[PDB]
Write a protein that binds this ligand. Structure first.
Ligand SMILES: [Fe+3]
Lengths: 90, 90, 90
């Protein structure tokens, strides 16, 4: 169903024609693509996106906790399940 | 302005020197880059980032609805347009 | 510690075996990967993800301000530091 090439570095490339799935895998290290001042980096510890604007076009689902250093501005409702702040007055 | 290579799989590579734009395109399937336990995957149904930390460095603009399974913690204001919860007490 | 290849376009590829770090760099332009209707694009002005679903699996840390055009739905608490709306009633 698939084939794999293993490189001298331990990295591999695999291609499953029964899925059209291409996989590049490194056991450890960092892969980075930079264009101007924008970067996508994939490393053992993180996936990092850095750019003048990071645009996510579609429904976004975070499986985890979201921490934002700056403000959070929503064009609709902002609805919790377990608690929000009383940092406002009626 | 550009040139294109079409592969036997239906995939293509194109390069516009009048924009310095490189495009790799697959009609269907999955492309994945894995480094350690971190992954970026692009498939017909999703773009998926999986990592011990997902770092977005810059202004983030979501064109869509954001769902977070865990908590949302903001270092500044969290301001809606259309409604927030009363899950707090004055 | 590393080696670099510089292309006729000003782009470069570098590999540090003392880090297993691969870097592709373009001074200016756009690099795009498309699979079906999903895309990851890296350009001078932005990193853009577009897909039927954008899945972020792990803790997400935004260093910047987050703007969401649609709703924000949290499965836990949503806690600010500096202010939230009074768009609700007790
Ligand atoms: Fe209140």
């Amino acid at each position: 169903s698939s084939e794999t090439w293993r490189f001298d570095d331990g990295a591999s490339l695999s291609y499953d024609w029964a899925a059209h799935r291409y996989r590049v895998e490194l056991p450890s290290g960092t892969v980075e693509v930079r264009v101007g001042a924008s970067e996508v980096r994939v490393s053992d510890g993180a996936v990092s996106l850095k750019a003048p604007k990071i645009s996510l076009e579609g429904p976004v689902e975070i499986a985890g906790t979201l921490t934002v250093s700056g403000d959070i501005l929503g064009g609709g409702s902002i609805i919790d399940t377990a608690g929000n702040s009383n940092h406002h007055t009626h």
